[PDB]
Structure 1
Amino acid sequence: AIAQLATEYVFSDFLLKEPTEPKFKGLRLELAVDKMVTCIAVGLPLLLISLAFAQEISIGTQISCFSPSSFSWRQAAFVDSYCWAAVQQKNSLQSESGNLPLWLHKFFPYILLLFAILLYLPPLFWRFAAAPHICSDLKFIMEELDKVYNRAIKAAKSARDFKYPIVEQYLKTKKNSNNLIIKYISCRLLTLIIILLACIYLGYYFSLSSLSDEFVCSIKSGILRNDSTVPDQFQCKLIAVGIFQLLSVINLVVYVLLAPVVVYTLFVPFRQKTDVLKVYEILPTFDVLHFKSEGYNDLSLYNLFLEENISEVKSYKCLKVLENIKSSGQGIDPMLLLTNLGMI
């Protein structure tokens, strides 16, 4: 039913499932905006496919040819099925709009499924190629941040009663390499191109005259070519073509609204803001150097992933509340850190 399709595709965790494995425990591995874009671009065409053939919106068979009254039920069924299979056969049918509109009307669900698959492909390539590496690197970075926070609080407590910046060096090294950012931009660009092509196709499909679904059909090949009792042609109409056009314009609207989001996603350096690591600069055990901005490198992408999935880090949360309290400046950062006692 329509409501069942809605529950499956919008109100359920459709493509929102976290990786089912212990390797990525709590790691999104995909930005929220990218996940939203993929979920829409994939589950919208599927939802429209399901809707267009819902038991309520669908009168019945997808084509009716209006055989003569003399024709029996199965003769008329032969006519309808023959014309359905003959939309491909150009000789059989003669339609003013041509045969491409008939092909599109017959295979619209296939085309929507193709667009959905093509849009799901780049996210899958990301999740299967560049996701494990970033997951491992980000897990190491979070562990290092937790360890340095613990060491700093222990030092502060000892004072009240190595020291090498490994994480900073690793981030600096990531500043050079750009394979991950190149893959990310390539997959986003392919998604954008697929969306644009889908928009072109949907606009063309919705621009039809709405009468191209009606085509003339001739079961006059073979032994029936010279038969007399059979009329030279029939009036066939492809039902649900109006529904297809409505859903196609809906998908076109959604995709044109979505494309600016993908373009904004492509410009990762601009998105790289609100320095996540700036909060850690007040730790004595952490060097006061952010050095993450203004670069078409994997460093900006790692900064984005950190700003996305750093809320799960207790040390980061503690430092964030310390920073927020520092806005008033009533107290002292080391005193607040010592009082917090948030090692684990």
Structure 2
Amino acid sequence: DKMVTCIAVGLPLLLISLAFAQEISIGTQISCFSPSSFSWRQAAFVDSYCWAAVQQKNSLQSESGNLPLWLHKFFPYILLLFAILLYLPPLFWRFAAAPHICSDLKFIMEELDKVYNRAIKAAIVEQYLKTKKNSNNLIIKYISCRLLTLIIILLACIYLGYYFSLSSLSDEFVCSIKSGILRNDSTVPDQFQCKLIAVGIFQLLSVINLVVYVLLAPVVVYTLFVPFRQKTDVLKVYEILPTFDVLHFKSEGYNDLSLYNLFLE
């Protein structure tokens, strides 16, 4: 499991730590330029207004190119989703395949202690391969949780890949106070080309989540092709190669890996 669970534990934890590293250096999020201390609380009001009138005006006030993109106000808010959607199919395996594979773990531990007392009497296990010869289409439910994550990883390497072509000059947006003008239509300056503060490290942290998950998307497929390279097809390996690894994974003893020493000597 380590070849899969190492990734499935470390990399969502990598993403939540990489979100929390940006959460260290928040401070504020936008800094609006009020007309050079014509007030102080009107400055905070303009800041709040433009921080909430990012998305509701669907007309052309930003004009930097395809402004319906919500000005990426949501990278912790999206990154938490993209962490938990990778975290969850491990929980689905743990809540749909873990007790059955735990009973099968007891079965294969009974197989190895039956091998041990067979060697004791030598100083039946051959029927257990018949117990794992059968149809057993339920193991493909277990392999789905790996391949379901690989869909979300693939679109993660697409969604962040949109962000770099996006972020040329998708920060310096103009913002009006138009209902604020519609208070009076009288005195307030009409628009304030404010600036988001986080676009500099939203970009150069979306390098790291992208290029790591680029360096990992073929790696999960490599676990799924050892079933192709081990003498039987993917519709036959389900009780062998998901069992051949786990037999040596949990526990062995003084006869398991001393078979081949005694097989060679």
The normalised TM-score by structure 2 is 0.76
Q: Which residue of 1 aligns with 2:235?
A: 277
Is contact 1:94–1:217 with CA below 8 Å preserved after alignment? yes
Secondary structure (helix, strand or coil) at the match of 1:101 reads coil
Farther off after superposition, 100-109 or 249-258: 100-109
Matched, 1:173 2:131: yes
Identity of aligned residues (%): 99
Is contact 2:227–2:237 with CA below 8 Å preserved after alignment? no
CA gap 1:129/1:72 in 2 versus in 1, 3 angstroms: same
Is contact 1:269–1:295 with CA below 8 Å preserved after alignment? no
Cα shift at 1:284: 26
Between the aligned partners of 2:140 and 2:116, the Cα distance in structure 1 is 32
CA gap 1:107/1:215 in 2 versus in 1, 3 angstroms: same
Cα shift at 1:142: 1.2
Between the aligned partners of 2:165 and 2:262, the Cα distance in structure 1 is 41
Deviations 1:105-151 (A, max 9, x none): 20111111111111111111011111111111122211232133124
Q: Which has the higher contact order (CA 8 A, sep 6+)?
A: 2
The normalised TM-score by structure 1 is 0.60
CA gap 1:45/1:36 in 2 versus in 1, 3 angstroms: same
CA gap 1:173/1:153 in 2 versus in 1, 3 angstroms: closer
Deviations 1:241-298 (A, max 9, x none): 1211111121111111101111112224146599999999999999999999999999
After superposition, the CA RMSD in angstroms is 8.1
Which of 52, 62, 68 is the aligned partner of 1:95?
62
CA gap 1:288/1:185 in 2 versus in 1, 3 angstroms: closer
Is contact 2:93–2:142 with CA below 8 Å preserved after alignment? yes
Between the aligned partners of 2:143 and 2:198, the Cα distance in structure 1 is 38
CA gap 1:295/1:251 in 2 versus in 1, 3 angstroms: farther
Is contact 1:217–1:236 with CA below 8 Å preserved after alignment? yes
CA gap 1:219/1:142 in 2 versus in 1, 3 angstroms: same
Between the aligned partners of 2:97 and 2:192, the Cα distance in structure 1 is 56
Between the aligned partners of 2:262 and 2:61, the Cα distance in structure 1 is 56
Is contact 2:227–2:241 with CA below 8 Å preserved after alignment? no
Query: Number of matched residues?
Result: 265
Is contact 2:164–2:203 with CA below 8 Å preserved after alignment? yes
Farther off after superposition, 49-58 or 239-248: 49-58
Structure 2 unaligned residues grouped into runs of 5+: none
| Structure 1 segment 284-303 matched on structure 2, within 5 A | none
Between the aligned partners of 1:284 and 1:40, the Cα distance in structure 2 is 18
Between the aligned partners of 1:263 and 1:300, the Cα distance in structure 2 is 32
Farther off after superposition, 128-137 or 92-101: 92-101
Is contact 2:228–2:234 with CA below 8 Å preserved after alignment? no
Structure 1 unaligned residues grouped into runs of 5+: 1-33, 157-165, 306-342
Cα shift at 1:104: 5.2
Between the aligned partners of 1:210 and 1:282, the Cα distance in structure 2 is 52
Is contact 1:152–1:283 with CA below 8 Å preserved after alignment? no
Is contact 1:272–1:303 with CA below 8 Å preserved after alignment? no
Is contact 1:88–1:103 with CA below 8 Å preserved after alignment? yes
Cα shift at 1:203: 0.5
Is contact 1:213–1:241 with CA below 8 Å preserved after alignment? yes
Q: Which residue of 2 aligns with 1:196?
A: 154
* Runs of 4+ in structure 1 over 4 Å off: 34-57, 98-102, 271-305
Is contact 1:41–1:116 with CA below 8 Å preserved after alignment? no
Between the aligned partners of 1:202 and 1:302, the Cα distance in structure 2 is 49
CA gap 1:276/1:47 in 2 versus in 1, 3 angstroms: closer
Secondary structure (helix, strand or coil) at the match of 2:251 reads coil
Which of 13, 17, 31 is the aligned partner of 1:64?
31
Between the aligned partners of 1:263 and 1:44, the Cα distance in structure 2 is 16
CA gap 1:103/1:267 in 2 versus in 1, 3 angstroms: same
Deviations 1:286-316 (A, max 9, x none): 99999999999999999999xxxxxxxxxxx
